[PDB]
Design an enzyme around this catalytic site. Structure first.
Site, short mmCIF file in Angstrom:
data_model
loop_
_atom_site.label_atom_id
_atom_site.label_comp_id
_atom_site.label_asym_id
_atom_site.label_seq_id
_atom_site.Cartn_x
_atom_site.Cartn_y
_atom_site.Cartn_z
N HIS A 15 0.86 -1.21 0.00
CA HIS A 15 0.00 0.00 0.00
C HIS A 15 0.88 1.25 0.00
CE1 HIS A 15 -2.70 3.16 1.26
NE2 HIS A 15 -3.70 2.40 0.80
N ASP A 17 0.76 4.28 1.06
CA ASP A 17 0.94 5.06 2.31
C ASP A 17 1.89 4.26 3.19
OD1 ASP A 17 -0.72 7.36 2.02
OD2 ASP A 17 -2.50 6.32 2.71
N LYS A 18 1.63 2.95 3.33
CA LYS A 18 2.51 2.08 4.18
C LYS A 18 3.92 2.04 3.58
CE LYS A 18 0.92 0.93 8.01
NZ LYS A 18 1.99 1.76 8.57
N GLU A 43 9.76 12.56 6.57
CA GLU A 43 8.49 12.41 5.85
C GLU A 43 8.77 11.88 4.43
OE1 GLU A 43 6.13 12.57 8.07
OE2 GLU A 43 6.05 14.50 9.19
N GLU A 56 13.42 16.94 8.42
CA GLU A 56 14.48 17.49 9.27
C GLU A 56 15.25 16.32 9.87
OE1 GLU A 56 10.96 18.47 10.33
OE2 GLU A 56 11.06 19.70 8.49
N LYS A 169 -5.43 -4.40 0.66
CA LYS A 169 -6.16 -3.91 1.87
C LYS A 169 -7.15 -4.99 2.28
CE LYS A 169 -7.34 0.38 1.80
NZ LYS A 169 -7.83 1.76 1.52
N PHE A 238 -8.23 -4.83 -10.23
CA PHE A 238 -7.18 -4.15 -9.42
C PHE A 238 -5.82 -4.53 -10.04
CE2 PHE A 238 -6.19 -3.21 -4.62
CZ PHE A 238 -5.14 -2.42 -4.98
N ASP A 246 -2.43 5.51 -6.69
CA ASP A 246 -2.83 6.32 -5.52
C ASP A 246 -1.56 6.88 -4.88
OD1 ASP A 246 -4.69 7.23 -3.40
OD2 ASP A 246 -4.26 5.37 -2.17
N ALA A 247 -1.44 8.20 -4.73
CA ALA A 247 -0.29 8.82 -4.02
C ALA A 247 -0.30 8.31 -2.58
CB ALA A 247 -0.45 10.29 -4.00
N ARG A 252 -0.38 8.34 7.27
CA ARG A 252 -1.79 8.28 6.83
C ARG A 252 -2.45 6.94 7.14
NH1 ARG A 252 -3.09 12.52 3.13
NH2 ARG A 252 -4.83 11.20 2.69
N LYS A 253 -1.87 6.16 8.06
CA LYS A 253 -2.38 4.82 8.44
C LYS A 253 -2.30 4.69 9.97
CE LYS A 253 -3.96 3.43 4.63
NZ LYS A 253 -4.36 4.83 4.36
N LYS A 273 10.23 9.13 12.92
CA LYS A 273 10.54 9.90 14.15
C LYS A 273 11.46 9.15 15.13
CE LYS A 273 6.02 12.12 13.83
NZ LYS A 273 4.82 12.34 14.66
N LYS A 277 10.39 12.43 19.88
CA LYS A 277 9.04 12.65 19.35
C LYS A 277 8.18 11.75 20.20
CE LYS A 277 11.63 14.58 16.12
NZ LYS A 277 13.01 14.95 16.48
N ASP A 279 5.09 11.51 20.24
CA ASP A 279 4.04 10.81 19.45
C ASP A 279 4.32 9.31 19.43
OD1 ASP A 279 2.31 12.93 18.60
OD2 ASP A 279 3.62 13.35 16.90
C1 LIG Z 1 -9.15 3.24 -3.98
S1 LIG Z 1 -7.58 4.08 -3.76
C2 LIG Z 1 -8.05 5.73 -3.08
C3 LIG Z 1 -8.81 6.65 -4.02
C4 LIG Z 1 -7.93 7.32 -5.08
N1 LIG Z 1 -7.11 8.40 -4.46
C5 LIG Z 1 -8.80 7.89 -6.20
O1 LIG Z 1 -8.26 8.69 -7.00
O2 LIG Z 1 -9.99 7.51 -6.26
C6 LIG Z 1 -7.08 3.56 -2.13
C7 LIG Z 1 -6.33 2.26 -2.14
O3 LIG Z 1 -7.21 1.23 -2.64
C8 LIG Z 1 -6.43 0.32 -3.37
N2 LIG Z 1 -6.88 0.31 -4.75
C9 LIG Z 1 -6.27 0.93 -5.81
N3 LIG Z 1 -6.87 0.69 -6.94
C10 LIG Z 1 -7.90 -0.20 -6.61
C11 LIG Z 1 -8.87 -0.85 -7.40
N4 LIG Z 1 -8.89 -0.72 -8.72
N5 LIG Z 1 -9.76 -1.67 -6.77
C12 LIG Z 1 -9.65 -1.82 -5.44
N6 LIG Z 1 -8.80 -1.23 -4.59
C13 LIG Z 1 -7.92 -0.44 -5.26
C14 LIG Z 1 -4.97 0.72 -3.21
O4 LIG Z 1 -4.48 0.09 -2.05
C15 LIG Z 1 -5.07 2.22 -3.00
O5 LIG Z 1 -3.94 2.70 -2.28
C1 LIG Z 2 8.06 21.08 17.14
S1 LIG Z 2 7.64 20.73 15.43
C2 LIG Z 2 7.78 18.90 15.36
C3 LIG Z 2 9.17 18.29 15.44
C4 LIG Z 2 10.10 18.72 14.29
N1 LIG Z 2 9.71 18.01 13.04
C5 LIG Z 2 11.57 18.42 14.67
O1 LIG Z 2 12.42 18.38 13.72
O2 LIG Z 2 11.83 18.25 15.89
C6 LIG Z 2 5.85 20.60 15.41
C7 LIG Z 2 5.17 21.93 15.47
O3 LIG Z 2 5.61 22.64 16.65
C8 LIG Z 2 5.57 24.01 16.38
N2 LIG Z 2 6.92 24.54 16.56
C9 LIG Z 2 7.88 24.74 15.60
N3 LIG Z 2 8.98 25.27 16.07
C10 LIG Z 2 8.74 25.44 17.42
C11 LIG Z 2 9.52 25.98 18.46
N4 LIG Z 2 10.73 26.49 18.30
N5 LIG Z 2 8.95 26.05 19.69
C12 LIG Z 2 7.72 25.54 19.85
N6 LIG Z 2 6.89 25.02 18.94
C13 LIG Z 2 7.46 25.01 17.73
C14 LIG Z 2 5.01 24.18 14.96
O4 LIG Z 2 3.60 24.27 14.96
C15 LIG Z 2 5.47 22.87 14.32
O5 LIG Z 2 4.69 22.55 13.17
K LIG Z 3 6.37 16.97 10.25
K LIG Z 4 -4.03 9.13 -1.50
MG LIG Z 5 -8.27 5.14 4.09
MG LIG Z 6 3.10 17.06 11.59
MG LIG Z 7 1.37 16.12 16.34
MG LIG Z 8 -4.12 7.27 1.48
#
Ligand SMILES: C[S@@+](CC[C@H](N)C(=O)[O-])C[C@H]1O[C@@H](n2cnc3c(N)ncnc32)[C@H](O)[C@@H]1O
Ligand SMILES: C[S@@+](CC[C@H](N)C(=O)[O-])C[C@H]1O[C@@H](n2cnc3c(N)ncnc32)[C@H](O)[C@@H]1O
Ligand SMILES: [K+]
Ligand SMILES: [K+]
Ligand SMILES: [Mg+2]
Ligand SMILES: [Mg+2]
Ligand SMILES: [Mg+2]
Ligand SMILES: [Mg+2]
Lengths: 394, 392
Positions: A15, A17-18, A43, A56, A169, A238, A246-247, A252-253, A273, A277, A279
């Site tokens: 997938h 996203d994964k 990212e 970063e 999926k 499929f 699909d981007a 996103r999961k 991360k 972090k 999270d």
């Molecule tokens: C259906 S797509 C999401 C919608 C897409 N962004 C669009 O433009 O409609 C989400 C996920 O479903 C799966 N998928 C892709 N094509 C598919 C298809 N033809 N039938 C079923 N699942 C599919 C893939 O895992 C894909 O990442």
């Molecule tokens: C702290 S950053 C997340 C971690 C970051 N990606 C890193 O490299 O550590 C998440 C959010 O915190 C806020 N943020 C950014 N710089 C910050 C700072 N110096 N002090 C506090 N919050 C900050 C912003 O909203 C940013 O999108």
């Molecule tokens: K980020």
């Molecule tokens: K997508």
């Molecule tokens: Mg979904």
């Molecule tokens: Mg973020």
């Molecule tokens: Mg957060």
């Molecule tokens: Mg997605």
């Protein structure tokens, strides 16, 4: 017996996203293997014939971001335009910079603060959950959807189903009874699989193979009956898949990463991360906490919340709820959990050995879920003894 | 002593780089629906230093300037110089947008040939809707206060009250709560946190003063504040670098902040950049309406509703209703009434909630400050439906 239906899904390693989650964690593992003190917020995003890693990283590691992308894509099976991305031909874009100096001074004083003084790397809140309904103390709906997705990958790679392509999926609807706030699975109501496939296989052969090779081997016999509803490639075709269809983006999961809609989520993504972090290190510690409460028999189910401010080590709040199933009052479970776990980010890192990369430590976490897994690298899965008096004993 | 627990929700304002991405994604959707309402849109956005990329899948008859939509969205938010973390006019805008997979398009909409009741879900997934009588908008107070403090933070920057403010800010509120037989009764605000971007002209004492008197005190009801409330005000000590320059942003990385702030549940799907065949959006919007209608009709004090889909199947695979022991009739009856009142087929939801109309920033307005608890008439999923039941 009054029952209800609860549904969770999963997606496998292919997938899009994964894939990004797995690439993000491949970069993390690489930075840590060379520099354990790496600051990583990596990212990833992907579309037709493109991968972009961005964000970063402050590391002493010598990294080639391009090779990590292309290797991760390869092992998953993305080796031609036909399967939806070509690891060796796709464009790889990089917009990676060092961590904001403004963040670095507050969090870790530019590599100078001691563990116990390390601030949360961000604000936010995280939840931990556990349930006595499966041996791994996870929700059945999540566990089946996830174990079906892993099987779907396994029969592609072991040659059991040669027609499979990587993108798949799953979704499982479980029919549950509430027993005094504990969740008792009754049966599997509905199973959905959608999987990418080549042009060699008919939809009758896909349905047959998925029931026989993928579903029956994973779902306990006692939850399957002749009314269980099966949707097997319900879209009817499929062939185009992966990023070509699909981007994908990192993070996103996050419900698939965690409890499949059970417990709760504070909304933070895990992949790419390092453990400043919260999270990630915070959700891992509250899973260990929630699991330890159920595993010690203090409750049948448990939800734990923690919350943080950036630059502050101590959590802003902690919550325990046992959904009415706790054998002692929830506030005494809260006191025992606060006494037993150190929620300070610098301590959580060390207690769970989260600064170790390599051997795909985190990359393994980035498909098939972060929780309920038996691999010893999943250190937050280890149950902690808890001190309390059990009603049943003198 | 009254037994209580602490529950924490956060929010971010429109200048958070993840939220910027949500508003670009939904600006693209708006532009598409304004020229072509049958637009199929899955528009993803990401951003880093001096860089925005739009990518994903659009099938539209619309004539769209993606590059101008990005810049105009960055501008109205206030990213107008490298000094505030992105310059709307300087930055590189990348586009990797292409047409929807024909394998999806045949199964979903029969390439624009399927009638509404026969329209397939554009994907599998599951979606939760929640409501609680603890605020008048039937949202959890932890989420509402974090969200409304973030919108005030933006408002005092734009209206010139706090001129040192830059666009990127985060909030978090911890509420102390009493459980009244499954109903949630807020007792007090235990902790308030704000981290906001800022220029070099202001001291931390000026930030802490301004944030309390201009931002917090106007938003949080007095009855919830006391002399023990903890306040963390720019706790990192310095937040000059912000926006994409301090943190990469992505569409769909704020789904809890978009929804109920950790209350109820989430199925994990993102909203922004999607048209209504995407049951992630139409699905969560109708279950919000159902949950809200149960609580607003007095059938329960709290309500959670799950729905699930399979791609290409109009009918949901599952529905559940839970009222956390607050229902005045059994939950299985509430489920019966919701199924009878609500049409969960994606072709039907789109028409019933008017979700094929964009422009006038219809969706761009949901891409910050949350999709629920707002009384803009464009938020058609906040309109309560009468439910036929017999009060015991
Ligand atoms: C259906 S797509 C999401 C919608 C897409 N962004 C669009 O433009 O409609 C989400 C996920 O479903 C799966 N998928 C892709 N094509 C598919 C298809 N033809 N039938 C079923 N699942 C599919 C893939 O895992 C894909 O990442
Ligand atoms: C702290 S950053 C997340 C971690 C970051 N990606 C890193 O490299 O550590 C998440 C959010 O915190 C806020 N943020 C950014 N710089 C910050 C700072 N110096 N002090 C506090 N919050 C900050 C912003 O909203 C940013 O999108
Ligand atoms: K980020
Ligand atoms: K997508
Ligand atoms: Mg979904
Ligand atoms: Mg973020
Ligand atoms: Mg957060
Ligand atoms: Mg997605």
């Amino acid at each position: 017996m009054e029952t209800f239906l609860f549904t969770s899904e999963s997606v496998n390693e292919g997938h899009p996203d994964k894939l990004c989650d797995q690439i993000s964690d491949a970069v993390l593992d690489a930075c840590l293997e060379q520099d354990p003190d790496s600051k990583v917020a990596c990212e990833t995003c992907t579309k037709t014939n493109m991968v972009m890693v961005f964000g970063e990283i402050t590391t002493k590691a010598t990294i080639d971001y391009e090779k990590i992308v292309r290797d991760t894509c390869r092992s998953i099976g993305f080796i031609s335009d036909d399967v939806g991305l070509d690891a060796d031909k796709c464009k790889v874009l990089v917009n990676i910079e060092q961590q904001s100096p403004d963040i670095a001074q507050g969090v870790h004083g530019h590599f100078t603060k001691r563990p116990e003084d390390i601030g949360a790397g961000d604000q936010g809140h995280m939840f931990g959950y556990a349930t006595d309904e499966t041996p791994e103390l996870m929700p059945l709906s999540h566990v089946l959807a996830t174990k079906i997705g892993a099987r779907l990958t396994e029969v592609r790679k072991n040659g059991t189903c040669r027609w499979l392509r990587p993108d798949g999926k799953t979704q499982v609807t479980v029919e549950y009874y509430n027993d005094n706030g504990a969740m008792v699975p009754v049966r599997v109501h509905t199973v959905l699989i959608s999987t990418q496939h080549d042009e060699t296989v008919t939809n009758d052969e896909i349905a047959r193979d998925l029931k026989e090779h993928v579903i029956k081997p994973i779902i306990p016999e006692k939850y399957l009956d002749d009314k269980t509803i099966f949707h097997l490639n319900p879209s009817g075709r499929f062939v185009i898949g992966g990023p070509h269809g699909d981007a994908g983006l990192t993070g996103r999961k996050i419900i698939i990463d965690t409890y499949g809609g059970w417990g709760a989520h504070g909304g933070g993504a895990f992949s790419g991360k390092d453990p400043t972090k919260v999270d990630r290190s915070g959700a891992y510690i509250v899973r260990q906490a929630a699991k330890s409460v159920v595993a010690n028999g203090m409750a049948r189910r448990a939800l734990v919340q923690v919350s943080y401010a950036i630059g502050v080590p101590e959590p802003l709040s902690v919550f325990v709820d046992t959904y009415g199933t706790g054998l002692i009052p929830d506030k005494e479970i809260l006191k025992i959990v606060k006494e037993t776990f150190d929620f300070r980010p610098g301590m959580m890192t060390i207690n769970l050995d989260l600064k170790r990369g390599g051997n795909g430590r985190f990359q393994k976490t980035a498909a098939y879920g972060h929780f309920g897994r038996d691999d010893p690298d999943f250190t937050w899965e280890v149950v902690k003894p808890l001190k309390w008096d059990k009603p049943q004993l003198n």
